Every structure is written in C-alpha cells, then in structure tokens.
Amino acid sequence: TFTKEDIRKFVEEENVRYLRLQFTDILGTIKNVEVPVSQLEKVLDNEMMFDGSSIEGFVRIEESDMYLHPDLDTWVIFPWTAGQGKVARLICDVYKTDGTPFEGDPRANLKRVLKEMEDLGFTDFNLGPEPEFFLFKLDEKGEPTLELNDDGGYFDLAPTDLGENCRRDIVLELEDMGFDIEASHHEVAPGQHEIDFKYADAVTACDNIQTFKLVVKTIARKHNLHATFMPKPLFGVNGSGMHFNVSLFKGKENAFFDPNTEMGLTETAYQFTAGVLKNARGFTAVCNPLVNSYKRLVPGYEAPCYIAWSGKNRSPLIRVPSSRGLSTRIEVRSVDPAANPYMALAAILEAGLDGIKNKLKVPEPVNQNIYEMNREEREAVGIQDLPSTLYTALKAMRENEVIKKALGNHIYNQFINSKSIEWDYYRTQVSEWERDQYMKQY
Amino acid sequence: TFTKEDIRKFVEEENVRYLRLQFTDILGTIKNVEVPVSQLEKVLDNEMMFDGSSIEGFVRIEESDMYLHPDLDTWVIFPWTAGQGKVARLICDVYKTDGTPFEGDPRANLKRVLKEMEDLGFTDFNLGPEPEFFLFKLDEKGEPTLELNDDGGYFDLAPTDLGENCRRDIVLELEDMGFDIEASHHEVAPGQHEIDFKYADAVTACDNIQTFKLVVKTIARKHNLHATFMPKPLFGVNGSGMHFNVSLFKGKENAFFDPNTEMGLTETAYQFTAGVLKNARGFTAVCNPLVNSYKRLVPGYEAPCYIAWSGKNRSPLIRVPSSRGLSTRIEVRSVDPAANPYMALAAILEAGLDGIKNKLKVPEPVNQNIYEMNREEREAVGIQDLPSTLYTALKAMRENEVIKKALGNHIYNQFINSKSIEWDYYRTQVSEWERDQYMKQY
Amino acid sequence: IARKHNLHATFMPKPLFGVNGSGMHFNVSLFKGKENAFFDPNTEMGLTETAYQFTAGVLKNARGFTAVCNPLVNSYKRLVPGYEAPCYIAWSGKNRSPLIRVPSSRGLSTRIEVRSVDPAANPYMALAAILEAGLDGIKNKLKVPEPVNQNIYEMNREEREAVGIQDLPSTLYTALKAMRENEVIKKALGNHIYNQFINSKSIEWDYYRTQVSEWERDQYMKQY
Ligand SMILES: Nc1ncnc2c1ncn2[C@@H]1O[C@H](COP(=O)(O)OP(=O)(O)O)[C@@H](O)[C@H]1O
Ligand SMILES: Nc1ncnc2c1ncn2[C@@H]1O[C@H](COP(=O)(O)OP(=O)(O)O)[C@@H](O)[C@H]1O
Ligand SMILES: C[S@](=O)(CC[C@H](N)C(=O)O)=NP(=O)(O)O
Ligand SMILES: C[S@](=O)(CC[C@H](N)C(=O)O)=NP(=O)(O)O
Ligand SMILES: C[S@](=O)(CC[C@H](N)C(=O)O)=NP(=O)(O)O
Ligand SMILES: [Mg+2]
Ligand SMILES: [Mg+2]
Ligand SMILES: [Mg+2]
Ligand SMILES: [Mg+2]
Ligand SMILES: [Mg+2]
Ligand SMILES: [Mg+2]
Ligand SMILES: [Mg+2]
Ligand SMILES: [Mg+2]
Ligand SMILES: [Mg+2]
C-alpha cells in the first residue's frame, strides 16, 4: 500500500505533469478525466467530482454530483508519454455526496465480496485472465473494416501471421507498465490474438484487464488496425473468450492444491467447482452480456456450451489445466471479453463460496468431447445447458439468488433493466439473414 | 363438381394446348409441371408422376416415386396466355404408389379435417383471406432492391401511391380467372398493398390464396417490381399479415350469426372463438412460420401480440368486424402471408372444433388498445402472450395436442424438424446489428 | 490548435439535433475580499442568505437576460428538454435539469452555476446581465422560491404550473420581447448596447423567419 506523500514524491521524481483518474461504468468501459499536476491535492484530498447522470448504470439527473476517491496502490506512468506531456494514472472508486461508497460502482462491489471471503479464511482471490481479441484493418479515413489482418491460425508464424510486431509493441508497453507478461501468440481464428500475463489479486487482476484492453486498442490503432473484444464477430470461426483462471490462497498457500492426491486437488477446490456449476445459469448474463455473446456459445469452437467440468479438456464449461502446484487452478471458460471484469469476478467468487459455505458435493467429470454427445445422451448423465440467448440468460438471472447477492440491488437492478432494452431493440430489427433468406422465396 | 368429359370438352372448345398441374409442398410454395394437351388422359387417368425426394417435407430418396391425381373442380385458363401457347391449370393432390393419398400433402390433409367438421353438422368452412404484400423496385439486371415503389400510406391516391396500375392489372387478370374481387387499395406501410376477394370453401379459399400470390408476383414483375409476402421486411413500418376471416355454414346458414341478439353472434361461434384462443400458442408456428414472422408480432402495428378477442378492434388477436348477417365472421389476425394456407386453416379449424366439441366458455372481450396495457395490468385480467420467437413457437407446438391432430404425424413431424434447422442456422449468424452496435464499443 | 490538428472547433449551441448541445455554464460567486460571501459555515445547507437573495435575483429576471445569454436562433434548439440544458426557471442543488444548479462543493467553492448561458454569448454582456439580476435580488432582498428537487423535465405542464415554474423563452423573438419588458437588463447593458443588440438580433430573426428549411421541403413538398 502506497502513501499520499508516496505519490507526492513520485510526481516530483519523474516530473509527471498530467494525471488521469480512471473508473469503470456498468458495461466495463473505462471512463476517465485528465487533470494537470497542479491539481494533485484536490485529487488526493478526494475533492475530485463528476456527473453520474451521464454514466450508464449509475444515477439520476437530480442525484448527479459524484466524487472520485483515488486508490493510490494503482499508480503507474505511461511508457510512451514523456517530456512536456508525461502522463500518470490512478484508478478510483466512486463515492456519493454522503462520503459513503456508491452502491452501484462495480469495483467497490468486488472489494465488498472479497471481505465476505477473507471472513472465510482466505488471504487472496487470485485471477489470471485470458482476454482474446481480433485485429481488423482500418481504411483510408481511419474506420474499421471487416478485413482481418491475417488469415493465420493457432501458433502461426509470419508472414502467415502479421500481428507479430503489434503484439510485440503491445508487450513492451505492457512490460514497461508493470505487467509480468507470460506469452504472446496467434490464436485459432483468422486475425485472432492472445497475450497472457501472470495472476494477481482479485481487484488488481480486473484493474489489469481494463488496462490491458486500453493498451491493445491504442497500440492496435497506431499499427493501423482496429482491435475488437467482441465475443463472436464472425460466424464460422472461433470467437474469443476471456478465460478466468481462478484460485484461493491462504497466504502463499495454494488452497486448491493437495500435494499427495494423484489428481492434486484439495476438495475446498472441489466444493468451489460445485458452486460455480450450481449457479452457472445464474451468472451467465454478466459473463456473457451481449446478444453477440450467445453466437459464440454454440458447439464446436472450444467455447463452453453445457455446464460440466473436466481436466485437460477444452470442450467443457470448466477446465482444470494439467498444471498443479502453486499454479493449480480452475479455468472458467464461459466468460467472454465483453464482460465487466469486476462484476464477472464477484459472480464467480460468490458462486464458489456458496459452494464451500454450503459444503457442496462436486459432480463427476466428463472426460470426453461434449460436442460429440447426443442431446439425450448428455441429458442421461444430467448435464444442464447454458442459456442459449441473452433473454434466457436474463430470466435465469432473476431466478438465481446467489447472483443478486454478488451484485447487490443497484447493480443487479440496473443490469437486468438495461440489458433488457438491448434485447428489446435487438428483437425488433430485421437481419440481412431474413431478408436474404425470405424476401425472394416468399 | 366437373366430369372427365367436362374437361375433355373444355380443351377442344378453347384449344388449350398446354396443361399445368399444380400442388403445394410443406412451406406453401406452388410446385408444378407443364404437359402438352397431347398428354391429357395420362393426366386424367392419374398416371402423372414426379419425384418426392426433391420436394421439401415429402419423402426419402428410396421412396421417391409419387403420383399426381388432378382435382377437376379446379380448372381455369390463364387470361394472358393465348393462341399457339394457351395454358390451363389443374390443382392436384399427391398419391403414393399405393393408390392411397400421401399423409404428407398439406391439401389432402385439409380435406381430412373438413370431414371431421361435416361430421359435426356443418356444410362448409368458409374462409376469406387478406394477403397483404410489399412492392419493391427492380434494378437494371432484374433483381430486387430495398427501394419501395412508393412512400404512400393507407388508402392513398396517385401520385402519392404508384402501385395503382399494377394492382389494376392484377385485378383484371384475377377477375378474368374467376375471382370475385372485393376491393383494392394501398395499406398502411410504404409500398404496401391489399387486394381482398370474396370468401369460398375451405379448400378453394386456399387454392385461391396460392393462385393469388402466383398472380401478384407475375404481374408485379411485368411492371418492373418485386412483390414479397415477407411478414416484416422492414423494421419500424407495418408488416403485412394474412387475416383469416372464418365462418361455419349450415348450407346458406351463417351459423355464427344470431339474428336477434344485439351483438348478433350465436354461441357456437362463441365456442369456436374459445378453442382458437385455447390453442393459439399451439398453432402460431404454422401461421407464423419464419423467424421474420416474429419481428412483426411486436406491439404497435395492428398485428396480434397477446391472445384476446374484441369487436371493432385491430389491437387484439381476434377481431369481430362490425359486419353481421350472412357476413358475420371472426377475423384471425395472427396468420401472416408466409404461412401455408392449407395447414394454417386445418390448425385454426380443429382448434375451433375442439372448442365446440368441448363446449368451451368464451373469455371476456378486451375493448381497449391492448398495446397501451401495462404488462402487469394485462397479466391481471390473465391474457396470455403469443410466442415471441420461432423457437418458443416450436416448443409451444410440441406441447399442444390439438395441433398434432390437425396436421398428423408426417406433417407435424416434418415441420418441427425442418423449422428447427432454420432456427439453428439463424441462431448462429452474426447480424449487422451486433457488429454495428458492438464491434467499435467493445 | 484544432485547425493545426486538421480539425474544426465550434462553440455553436447545438450544431446537431438529437445529441447534447454545448453550453457555457457560468459558475459565479460573490466575495468580500478573500472570503466567499456565498458560504455560511455554520448552517447545514452551506449557503448564506446573500447567496439566496442573489439567486432569487437571477431567477426573477431570467426571462429578461435570456436573449443575451442565448443570442443565436440556434441557441433555442439547445433549450429543448432532455439534454442537461435548462428550459424551466428553477434551482436545485445536486441536480442538472434546472436553470440554476448549486454544486455539492462548499467552502471557498460555494457558487451558483447558471446553466442557461451558451458559449455563443458575449461573456462581458452575459456576466453584466447576471450580475445585475443578482444585484437586484440583493438590494431588494427578495426571498428565493423553494428548490425543485426532481428531474424537472418529467414534470407535466399541470405539475409545473402548480408549483409556479415559468418556462424560459422558447424562441429568439420571444426572448427579445421578454428582454424589452425586463427593465433590469436595460440598466445592465446601457442604452447603446441594449439598442444595438435588439436591432442586430431582430433582423437576424427576420432573415430566419423567412427562410425555407429543407425540413419543410422534406415534409410538405411531396405531401401537399
Ligand atoms: N494458481 C493460479 N491462480 C490463478 N491463475 C493462475 C494460477 N496459475 C496460473 N494462473 C493463470 O493462468 C493463466 C494461463 O493462461 P494460459 O497460459 O493461456 O492457459 P491455457 O493456454 O492452458 O488456457 C495466466 O494468466 C495465469 O495468471
Ligand atoms: N361470413 C364470412 N365468412 C368468411 N369470410 C367472410 C365472411 N364475410 C366476409 N368475409 C371475408 O372477409 C374479407 C373482408 O376483408 P376486408 O374487407 O379486408 O376486411 P377489413 O378490412 O375490415 O379487415 C373478405 O375476404 C371476405 O371473403
Ligand atoms: C485454443 S483456446 O483454448 C480457444 C478459446 C475459445 N475461442 C473461447 O471462446 O474461449 N483457448 P486458450 O488456449 O487461450 O486457453
Ligand atoms: C389496417 S390493417 O387493419 C393492418 C394489417 C397489419 N399490417 C397486419 O400485420 O395484420 N389490416 P386490414 O384493414 O387489412 O384488416
Ligand atoms: C453533463 S453536463 O453537465 C452537460 C451540459 C450541456 N453541455 C449543456 O449545457 O447543454 N455539463 P458539466 O458536467 O460539464 O457541467
Ligand atoms: Mg443515464
Ligand atoms: Mg516508450
Ligand atoms: Mg492461452
Ligand atoms: Mg484458456
Ligand atoms: Mg428432400
Ligand atoms: Mg388477356
Ligand atoms: Mg382489408
Ligand atoms: Mg383484416
Ligand atoms: Mg457544469
């Protein structure tokens, strides 16, 4: 944890002339404002203010004044800004005029579930995300095209894979920002890319994801490309998800890892798996929040389709990578990169604690390709399906109690409400598909 | 009813040189073959044959030989063919190599329900359809555009309404074919048109609808236009439905019309209304068979949204026009022009007979604008909603028993099966809407 | 600079229909020499009665100074409801629908933010206007109507007439006439500036009154 004179010393020592205070609305979009260094004890005295009317999911126009309280632990400088315009950043939580934190701030809300988990004996909730993304070419006037940067596949090399330097450039700015980058490569789909980085505290992991996406889209544009984290932007090729590798620690204890078992898993980790499977239908709407999200949750693309766990398996909802030890984890593959990381985490966490709190029994693993399983054959072993559309996700959300717990009223309410207009709007448009499949035949 | 020497005399007297035998597959598409007059006792001896493998909804490639049995009552000549190439037409039912009628022929299937209704005391099942349609401009190479012929509205005149002569031309060919045309006008939406004609026997009414559409699309093309019966081809304007005005007759008895009641309805007509409301969810999938069909079953466009009846009302599922007397009818507004007329009729008929057979009690009428009714306020008076998507229509179909009765196994089965692939295919594509609403924001 | 970036900056009140207009909010205060004469540290509100008298001031005369603070025909396509621009004469704290908003900041930051002004206004005239409107409320010590602490856009005519909320002038012409009866504004600009602003803008209006929009041709030229 950093001091207030910690960051006072930092702005002198590096001559940081501008400060970007950041936070996150309900859809997971970074929102921020730049302030000259001149203003640094307004920001440090927490007297920074903004307008909640114009933030989706926050507040009404008559209740609109809101405050930013910076979190000094988040401090970081941008390795490409420098000189007369060197820029530094602080992520903030949102406070009301009360002086009290805002019930509707996704991030403070994660901090809230994390106390419900340190009350059950655990030090940290560690997350390692796998945010995949596509790269599209830009046109003369700087706007995206439907033309992917390459037509390469998994682990391909240049010139089959042309995102090489862009990913390199992304990595070095990320590296020069504090990330421990783990790997960088081309994923399965044409123009699809992956850059993995090391796990971190529940809150700082999401802080990481929201910075990750900021850097991907900014460098991508400099390379004359458009980066999208849209779950499934083209039909018939792999979508891109955000796999959430997750683990509880008892202070350098990997509490999921039993060191003499042959499969190497404690069963407080077994019970965790039980709760996320019990509540999977419940939280899908926050881990798959677009209508586009469900066009990626169809079989055949290494995306979770049915609710089940297995090891060394990319067909199921929950993989347990072969890696054990301090790296023993469960990878939750449903989440896609459009999900609000802070909220997706609170849902998965509380879903896993109501799995231990309730001492729940794990189901048996499906060590098969689930996509090759007959509907009746999978109904035989009793495996549920995930919601097939955002509407069905929504209604499964208002049935599940564990999710309202994880999100609270203001967020739970402002979410069902907003994602139901996006469904209404979408269930009125006429797709090129119908017109293309119906207007001449009928 | 006509004789075989009836039509022998007809081909001599007019010198009809070509014969078009017609029938209908499961999606309501006219299928036919032209035969020289040379072949007229092959056709009359029922020795005409074709291939059921290549007809959707019929039969397998190993069971493929099928026969046509013409229905001589249907005879009609085309008032635009003449001379060396004068053409005449006979609608046929499909028979197997058995000699027995094909279980899967929508039309013979209507004839089958009609015997289940003359066994309950009624002479005819009379239908008057209102098939609405749009007119799109063609381009240089003869292919449709998204440009409507006019930007007129209801009952408009030229030059605001430019479909005048086309509709005229349609009417005179229709008139010269035996239709008693009733009215012709521009309906609510831009480039939308209506041409009503007088009611007829259950079977000949559908025979009429399938000819209607044939003539609309043929004249429309000569006028350099493209006619579509797509339910909802553009968002934000009125779709076009096929209102089914329906009545039972006891031989010139309008059995729906009570002549001293003030509202003028017998209650064998009241019980009929009860059964179509009891089974509405069941048969929607056949009266609204496209995914496009449900983009028209959204509130605000004079299309049925919730299951309810009223009089003088275009907001509800079932209208009872002010017209009483020999014209007392219930108009069933859900049906849209993409529905197979023969099948839509069997569903609505059997739905209404299980309403009298079961002596069912009518509900109370909603004499209001149902679209202005709060969701909870309409849940208060207990009015169901129609299926919001073709998938929900399908599953409501496999629950309802009255519909499997109306369609039989081969048709019921071949329908759930085929319209579920069209849903699968459609619930995999990525709409310009998502890419347009998601690819830059995420 | 915007040009040096191949861009074009405009302070036009609402260059585009259907999205927020750009307004030039005037947060103002009165000082008695290093101390914010708007801020009472004892009371819970945070406001002295000079701040109350002062806003009673601008509220009372808002109709009169509106033409000067919203001086283009375009100005009045921003005073449409629903875009965080005001269109009713009212005041609230913490609230962005009303004419005057008073921010949560107190201490040396206590102030009234007059949301009416748009960036097309002549700052020295608008400020001269608001200052004397306030100065009127201070030397007649008017007492302030009670605040309107809801979204003032979602209120019906019946619901606003009840509480006594006057609209601001809908058009520039109507704003000019509001300007000719309000006498406090005439002393604010002086005879010379008052007259020539009125002239200049009266004839600006006449030119707009006679234009034919292609709004109109896109509606009436095929319909009628
Ligand atoms: N104990 C752990 N808890 C949480 N995350 C972990 C743990 N061990 C490793 N990880 C995370 O797993 C991720 C590895 O992802 P990746 O290498 O793409 O896996 P794979 O390719 O097998 O799916 C890293 O992001 C890292 O943070
Ligand atoms: N007794 C009846 N039974 C069945 N159909 C009828 C009866 N009387 C009239 N019709 C039909 O009603 C239709 C009238 O449709 P239309 O004039 O467009 O009605 P509206 O415009 O009021 O909806 C005709 O197609 C006609 O066949
Ligand atoms: C080869 S893949 O395994 C495919 C990811 C998939 N497109 C998804 O939607 O999660 N994922 P990874 O190697 O990143 O764990
Ligand atoms: C004015 S309308 O009443 C509108 C028909 C609507 N578009 C529908 O989908 O049925 N129908 P009609 O006058 O043909 O009975
Ligand atoms: C949310 S807004 O509050 C919008 C004001 C708008 N531009 C207008 O005055 O039309 N402005 P700000 O928070 O900068 O005061
Ligand atoms: Mg808002
Ligand atoms: Mg650098
Ligand atoms: Mg990986
Ligand atoms: Mg993974
Ligand atoms: Mg076939
Ligand atoms: Mg002719
Ligand atoms: Mg009509
Ligand atoms: Mg009708
Ligand atoms: Mg402001």
Residue numbers in the entry:
A (entry chain E), B (entry chain E): 5 to 446
C (entry chain A): 223 to 446
Published text:
In Gram-positive bacteria, nitrogen homeostasis is controlled by an operon encoding glutamine synthetase (GS), a dodecameric machine that assimilates ammonium into glutamine, and the GlnR repressor. GlnR detects nitrogen excess indirectly by binding glutamine-feedback-inhibited-GS (FBI-GS), which activates its transcription-repression function. GS generates glutamine from glutamate, ATP, and ammonium by a mechanism that involves the initial phosphorylation of the γ-carboxyl group of glutamate by ATP and the subsequent incorporation of ammonium. The structures show FBI-GS binds the GlnR C-terminal domain within its active-site cavity, juxtaposing two GlnR monomers to form a DNA-binding-competent GlnR dimer.
To visualize the active, transition state (TS) conformations of the GS proteins we reacted them with l-methionine-S-sulfoximine (MSO) in the presence of ATP and solved the structures. In these structures, the Met-Sox-P methyl group occupies the ammonium substrate binding site, thus mimicking the GS transition state and preventing further reaction. Structures of the Pp, Lm, and Sa GS-Met-Sox-P-ADP complexes were obtained to 1.98, 3.50, and 2.95 Å resolution, respectively. These structures were all dodecameric and densities for Met-Sox-P and ADP were clearly observed in each enzyme. The GS TS structures all display the same contacts to the Met-Sox-P and ADP. Strikingly, while the TS structures are similar to each other, they show significant differences, both global and local, when compared to the corresponding apo and FBI-GS-GlnR bound states (as apo and FBI-GS-GlnR conformations are the same, the state will be referred to as apo/FBI-GS-GlnR). The largest local structural changes between the GS TS and apo GS/FBI-GS-GlnR-bound states are within the active site loop regions (rmsd of apo GS/FBI-GS-GlnR versus Met-Sox-bound GS subunits is 2.0–2.5 Å for 400 corresponding Cα atoms), but the rmsds are 0.8 Å when the active site loops are not included. Moreover, superimposition of the TS dodecamer onto the apo GS or FBI-GS-GlnR bound oligomers (comparing Cα atoms of the dodecamers) results in rmsds of >3.0 Å, indicating that the catalytically induced structural changes are transmitted between subunits, causing significant alterations in the oligomeric structure. In the TS state, Asp62´ and Arg316 are repositioned to provide an optimal active site architecture. Thus, our structural analyses indicate that GS enzymes from low G + C Gram-positive bacteria adopt two distinct states, the active, TS conformation (herein termed the “A” state) and the conformation adopted by apo GS/FBI-GS-GlnR, termed the “I” or inhibited state.
